[PDB]
Amino acid sequence: SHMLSEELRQIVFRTIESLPEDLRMAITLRELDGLSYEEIAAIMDCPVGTVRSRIFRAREAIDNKVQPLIR
DNA sequence: CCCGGAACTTCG
DNA sequence: CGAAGTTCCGG
């Protein structure tokens, strides 16, 4: 309820939620399901290299919403 | 603009 | 070394 640390966790969830389906799924399978890149690539039927960038780019989007928040 | 993937780099 | 993570040349 409005304390900074609380604003930050909500910002993380909210940003994951608004990501493009592929980025959201790739970051979700990695962070919440704890899957390996290999596994995620099978689930998403795509090259693992695409999993690498998708996860990278999903992380970037989360960080661009979080960094403007700390100190 | 929004990323796809593979090369390249770091980490466990 | 194998998995995770970073970068870049496209398309």
Residue numbers in the entry: 9 to 10, 122 to 190
Which passages does the manuscript contain on this structure?
Thin rectangular crystals grown using a 12-bp DNA fragment diffracted to 2.3 Å-resolution. The crystallographically related DNA helices packed head-to-tail, forming a pseudo-continuous double helix with the 1 bp overhangs forming Hoogstein base pairs with the adjacent double helices. Protein–DNA interactions, which occur exclusively within the major groove, extend from −29 to −36, spanning the entire −35 element as well as one base of upstream DNA. Interestingly, the primary base-specific protein–DNA interactions occur at only three positions of the 7-bp −35 element (all Guanines), −35, −34, and −31′. The upstream edge of the −35 element is recognized through a series of hydrogen bonds and van der Waals interactions, mostly between R176 and S172 and the guanine bases at −35 and −34. In addition, R176 forms a cation–π interaction with the −36 DNA base, creating a stair motif along with the −35 hydrogen bonds. The protein–DNA base-specific interactions at the −31′ position are almost exclusively from R171, which makes two hydrogen bonds and one van der Waals interaction with the −31′G. In contrast to the numerous base-specific interactions at the −35, −34, and −31′ positions, the −33 and −32 positions each contain only one base-specific contact, in the form of van der Waals interactions between the thymidine C5-methyl groups at −33′ and −32′ with F175 and R171, respectively. Despite not being a true oligo(dA) • oligo(dT) tract as a result of the cytosine insertion at −31, the σE −35 element DNA is relatively straight, with a high degree of propeller twist, and the minor groove width begins to narrow at the start of the −33/−32 AA. The narrow minor groove is stabilized by a network of cross-strand hydrogen bonds between adjacent DNA bases, along with a spine of hydration consisting of water-mediated hydrogen bonds between the two strands.
The largest and most diverse subgroup of alternative σ factors, the group IV extracytoplasmic function σ factors, directs the transcription of genes that regulate a wide variety of responses, including envelope stress and pathogenesis. The Ec ECF σ factor σE is an essential protein that directs the response to periplasmic stress. The σE is then free to bind RNAP and drive the transcription of a core set of genes conserved across most bacteria, as well as a more variable set of genes. Promoter-specific transcription initiation first requires the formation of a closed complex in which σ domains 2 (σ2) and 4 (σ4) bind sequence-specifically to the −10 and −35 promoter DNA elements, respectively.
